[PDB]
Amino acid sequence: MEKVLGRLKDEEIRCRKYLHPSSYTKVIHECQQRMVADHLQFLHAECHNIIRQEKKNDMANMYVLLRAVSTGLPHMIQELQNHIHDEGLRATSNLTQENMPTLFVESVLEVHGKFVQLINTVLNGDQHFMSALDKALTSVVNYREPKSVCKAPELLAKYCDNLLKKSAKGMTENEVEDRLTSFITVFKYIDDKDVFQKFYARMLAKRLIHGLSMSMDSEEAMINKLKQACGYEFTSKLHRMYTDMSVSADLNNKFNNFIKNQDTVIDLGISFQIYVLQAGAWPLTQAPSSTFAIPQELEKSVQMFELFYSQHFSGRKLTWLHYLCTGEVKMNYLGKPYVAMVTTYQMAVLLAFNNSETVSYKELQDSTQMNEKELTKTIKSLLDVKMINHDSEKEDIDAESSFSLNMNFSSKRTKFKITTSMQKDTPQEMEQTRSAVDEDRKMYLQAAIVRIMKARKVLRHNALIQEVISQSRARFNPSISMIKKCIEVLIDKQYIERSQASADEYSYV
Amino acid sequence: MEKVLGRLKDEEIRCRKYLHPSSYTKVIHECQQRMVADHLQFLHAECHNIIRQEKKNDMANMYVLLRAVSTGLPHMIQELQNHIHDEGLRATSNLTQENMPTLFVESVLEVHGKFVQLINTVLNGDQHFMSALDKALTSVVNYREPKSVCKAPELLAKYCDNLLKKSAKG
Amino acid sequence: RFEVKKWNAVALWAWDIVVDNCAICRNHIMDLCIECQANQASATSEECTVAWGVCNHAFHFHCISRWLKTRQVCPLDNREWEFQKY
Ligand SMILES: [Zn+2]
Ligand SMILES: [Zn+2]
Ligand SMILES: [Zn+2]
């Protein structure tokens, strides 16, 4: 390599000082096509060794010579892509479960930064090599275990949730901003952005409703960065969520002005402050369809707010949510030791205890009208925090379930919180999120399929697969089974049909 | 409509293995004239609730039923057009003046992007429906303030200028 | 005795427009408005016209009249309200 570059420089200055100016390119071309292109096999054979060894100057000279060759460069591109892929696998698959998201993103950032620095310095920043690096890192972060899972979107969502949540560890605003700006580089190669979008929507709901965000400006900056990463259709739901959480303050002010401008004194008796959210863009849902009974002292406020939202807004039914609802309660029954934050599910049975110390499961059922599962969950949560004690022989759930209040509660905290389901992340709800993602994937695939068929009405199976892969490449990587299921669904709805002459070709219904 | 489609699909099967092949159309056509074409007043009345809440399952079953009857579609075309025109107006408006062009073009495109993605999966890109979408977005793009001039051409002028200007933001 | 102090709750709102219905009175457009539903003896049942905006939306005239005294924006779609019909 050294001799070839030195002799090439000598020949360049020689032909420049001797020949006509119009022949310099031809002299160089014949001085390389018969010098390194004839010995291209040896250089290609040594290319993998020279890439893996990561010797700087020799790699730079090899890149110069292979760029001189018309068909000498792609082998080096493949060798470098394979090296980066192997380095990423050995730098990511060895990670532990003690802290997977933060360390995973840090390792991907370190590998990406080192390779970008190397490409910019000793590789002239070729776009072919940058594309090879992007493909290699895409294969690295999507280290899908065989036919089981894909942990990259969940890990990145957990990373964003960990860094943006108000934590006592301590992270300043500007550090959060630059860390997220670096994070977008990692997110730009996921090829599974739907799962990350849904997981980030869930974590944004959990953070915003409980007020765990350190600053709304951080959330807006993160949402803007995501919008610049993918597009508005990627972040429309998130932006609507943030807009609703911002305008919640104005809505509370308008509600307070409305209840201070009424003819009579409402006298709600509580520190009411609502979090009205749009039903169309929040990942919450009324899956627990169990009927809940609002306590009367809150029933007055619910009726007043329902009237307000029917007056100062129109055509908006107000689907109340309770399993996100929570608030503070006082306990001066036993001497007022502290004030307890409590979800309204447990607040209902607390008011039932306030009605009478001796209460059975049937009384809770007729006072709250809620299902057995949610009532059992609230009861076990109360006894797990030792709020109440089971008077039965066994402490688990039973048909009778006769118990009263535990008077031994003397917790030191003056604002002790009995609810801690801020993380949750049950595998059942994660599987539900995966199923919703799969349903959106099926919708997108059906949209692309019907659009293509309306465009041409005659395509084979392989072309359909290729165009579905290409068009949906910015969202996910669809499987053959998913596309077959979608085309079978369109068969079932008498929307699509295969050709009678050949099953490869399809038709229109 | 779920039970109708169960009967209509069965009636194609039942007439297939029982009757002459030349009477397949006449049995199904008279089936529709007693099950879906005699309840146009009922189906169009409940068509309004289907489109507004965007029930993908029921909208698909309404489309296959109302396609058979001659007059079934033109009321649903008017209903979806009224829904898109309403759904467009929410997206275009309530926008801050700091980033009016980029938010406006994104919001109309997002409504167009979602509803094209909804027509194809449910209504199968019916050209009658695509005209209803294009008519509806024409009203929402060219929407006008009271005693003012339409702000659509100026707003897209700034958007294509912002997109093409030398900007360091990616 | 138990006393509740804070009830910071979450409410979901979705569009609930039903056909030929006043978005404010939550009843049929052709009937009287809920403001004129009471004291029907005083109401002549003729002044409750169906006001139509430029967005092809139907309210009672009294309803949109009371609406305009606070805001000049249509409740159904967040645009400025312009009458076109009577
Ligand atoms: Zn009214
Ligand atoms: Zn009236
Ligand atoms: Zn309107």
Whether A449 contacts A464, CB under 8 Å:
yes
Backbone angles phi, psi at A327, to 5 degrees: 180, 180
Q: Among A273, A295, A198, A190, which Cα is nearest to A241's? A: A198
Distance of CA C25 to the CA centre of its chain: 5
Task: Output the CA torsion A204→A205→A208→A211 (10° steps).
Answer: -110
Is residue B82 within 8 A of residue C55, CB to CB? The reply is: no
Question: Does A443 sit within 8 Å of B124, measured CB to CB?
Answer: no
What one-character-per-residue DSSP string does A455-471 give?
HHS---HHHHHHHHHHH
| Number of the ligand closest to the Cα of C81 | 3
- Cβ-proximal residues to A267 (8 Å cutoff; 6+ apart), any chain: none
The residues of B whose Cβ lies within 8 A of any Cβ of C are 45, 48-49, 52-53, 82, 85-86, 89-90, 93-94, 143-146
CB contact under 8 A, A286 and C3: no
Q: What is the dihedral of CA A253, A259, A262, A264, to 10 degrees?
A: -160
Query: Nearest C-alpha of chain C: how many angstroms from B145?
Result: 7
Ligand 3 mean position, distance from CA B144 (Å): 13
- The one-letter amino acid code at A259 reads I
At C53 the three-state DSSP class reads: strand
Alpha helices in A19-100 (DSSP H): 24-33, 40-53, 56-68, 73-92
- The token pair that represents A484 in the structure block: 């077959």
Phi and psi for A126 in degrees, rounded to 5? -65, 140
Q: Is C28 annotated as a binding residue?
A: no
Rg (chain B; Cα; Å): 22
- For helices A73-92 and A40-53, the axis angle rounded to 10 degrees is 20
H/E run at residue A491: helix A480-492
Contact across the interface for C77 and B45, Cβ inside 8 Å: no
Q: Which residue in B79, B134, B142, B78 sits closest to B111, CA to CA? A: B134
CA of C46 to the centre of ligand 1 (A): 14
In Å, how far is A271's CA from the nearest CA of chain B? 30
**Locus of tokens 């084979």:** A460
Q: What Å resolution does this PDB entry report?
A: 3.9
* Separation between Cα atoms, residue B72 and residue B66, nearest integer Å: 4
Q: C60 — phi, psi (to 5°)?
A: -70, 150
Residues in A touching B120 (Cβ below 8 Å): 446-447, 450-451, 454
Cross-chain CB nearest to C7 (options A278, A315, A327) = A327
Residue A95 corresponds to which tokens in the numbers above?
């990670």
Output the six-digit token pair for A98: 């003690």
How distant, in Å, are the alpha carbons of A190, A468, B42 from that of A474?
Answer: 10, 11, 43
Ligand-binding site membership of C77 (annotated): yes
Burial of A108 (0-12, 13-18, 19+ CB in 10 A): buried
Closest CA to B79 of B5, B117, B35, B136: B136
The contacts of residue A151 (CB under 8 Å, 6+ apart) are: A100, A143, A145
Cα four-point dihedral sign B120, B123, B127, B133:
negative
Residues ≥6 apart with Cβ < 8 Å to B161:
none
Cα B81 to middle of ligand 3, angstroms: 15
Q: Coil, helix or strand for A254? A: helix
Name the residue facing A447 among B60, B110, B120 (closest C-beta).
B120
CA angle (B95, B96, B99) in 5-degree steps: 100
Residue C25 annotated in ligand binding? yes
Distance from CA of A138 to the nearest CA of C (A): 38
**What would the two tokens of residue A466 be?**
């290729």
CB atoms within 10 A of CB A343: 18
Experimental method of this PDB entry: cryo-EM
Distances (CA, A) of A361 to A379, A390, A399, C2: 10, 11, 7, 20
Identify which of B86, B92, B48 has the alpha carbon closest to the alpha carbon of residue C54: B86
Place of tokens 């409750």: C48
Instruction: Confirm or reject contact between B113 and chain A (CB < 8 A).
Output: yes
Nearest CA-CA partner of A472 in A495, A504, A491, A446 = A446
Give the Å distance between the CA of B27 and the centre of ligand 1: 48
Angle at the Cα of A185 from the Cα atoms of A182 and A188, rounded to 5 degrees? 150
Contacts of B107 in chain A (CB under 8 A): 232
User: Measured between beta carbons, which residues in chain C are less than 8 angstroms from residue A284?
Assistant: 10, 12
Residue in C14, C55, C82 closest to B146 by CB:
C82
Distance (Å) from the C-alpha of residue B60 to the closest C-alpha of chain A?
Answer: 8
Distance separating alpha carbons of residues A274 and A247, to the nearest angstrom: 11
- For Cα atoms C66, C71, C76, give the angle at the middle one, nearest 5 degrees: 85
What letter represents residue B45's amino acid?
Answer: A
Tokens coding A65: 């010579």
Name chain B contacts of C77, Cβ cutoff 8 Å. Answer: 86, 89-90, 93
Closest residue, chain A, to B119 (C-alpha): A447
Question: What is the distance between the alpha carbons of residues B106 and A265, in angstroms, rounded to a whole number?
Answer: 46
Q: Does the CB of B106 have a partner CB in chain A at under 8 Å?
A: yes
- Output phi, psi for A417, to 5 deg: -105, 125
From first CA to last CA, the distance across chain A in angstroms is 65
Spacing of C-alpha A401 from chain mean position = 41
Torsion of CA B67, B76, A285, A479, to 10 degrees: 40
Distance from the alpha carbon of residue B168 to the mean position of ligand 3, in angstroms = 40
Residue A390 host element (H or E): strand A388-390
Is residue C49 within 8 Å of residue A351, measured between CB atoms? no
Q: Do B93 and C82 touch (CB under 8 A)?
A: no
Distance, C-alpha A454 to centroid of its chain: 33
Locate C70 and state its tokens.
């606070």
Amino acid at B29: H
Tell me, yes or no, if B120 comes closer than 8 A to chain A by beta carbon.
Answer: yes
Q: C25-28 contacts: CB < 8 A, separation 24 or more?
A: C25/C60, C25/C63, C26/A310
B124 touches A at CB < 8 Å:
yes
CA distance B103 to chain A (A): 9
**Polymer length of chain C:** 86
CA–CA–CA angle A409, A415, A421 (5° rounding): 90
**Nearest 10 degrees: Cα torsion C54, C59, C61, C64:** -80
DSSP of B56-120, one letter per residue? HHHHHHHHHHHHHSTTHHHHHHHHHHHHHHHHHHHHHSS--GGGHHHHHHHHHHHHHHHHHHHII
A267 backbone φψ class: left, alpha, beta (φ>0; ψ -120 to 50): left
3-state secondary structure of B45: helix
Q: How far apart are CA B162 and CA B98, in angstroms?
A: 13
Say whether residue A104 is in contact with chain B using an 8 A CB cutoff.
no
Phi, psi of A280 (to 5 degrees): -75, -25
Residue with tokens 């993160």: A222
Closest CA to B143 of B94, B76, B74, B75: B94
CB atoms A450 and B125 under 8 Å: yes
What residues are paired with C21 via a beta bridge? Answer: C28
B45:C15 CB<8 A = no
Chain C residues within 8 angstroms (CB to CB) of chain A: 1-17, 23-24, 26, 70, 75-76
Per CB-CB distance under 8 Å, the chain C contacts of B103 are: none
Distance A432 CA to ligand 2 centre (A): 49
Q: How far is the CA of C30 from the centre of ligand 1 (A)?
A: 9
Question: A359 - beta bridge partners?
Answer: A403
Cβ pair C79:B85 closer than 8 A = no
B6 lies within 8 A of chain A by CB: no
Beta bridge partners of B15: none
**Partner residue opposite B120 with nearest CB, options A233, A451, A494:** A451
Query: Measuring CA to CA, which residue among A486, A489, A487, A507 is closest to residue A498?
Result: A507
Q: Which residue of A has its CA nearest to C10?
A: A275
C-alpha C22 – ligand 2 centre gap (Å): 12
Give the nearest partner residue to A233 out of B56, B110, B124, using CB atoms. B110
Q: Kindly compute the dihedral angle of the four CA atoms of residues A404, A405, A408, A413, in this order, to the nearest 10 degrees.
A: 150
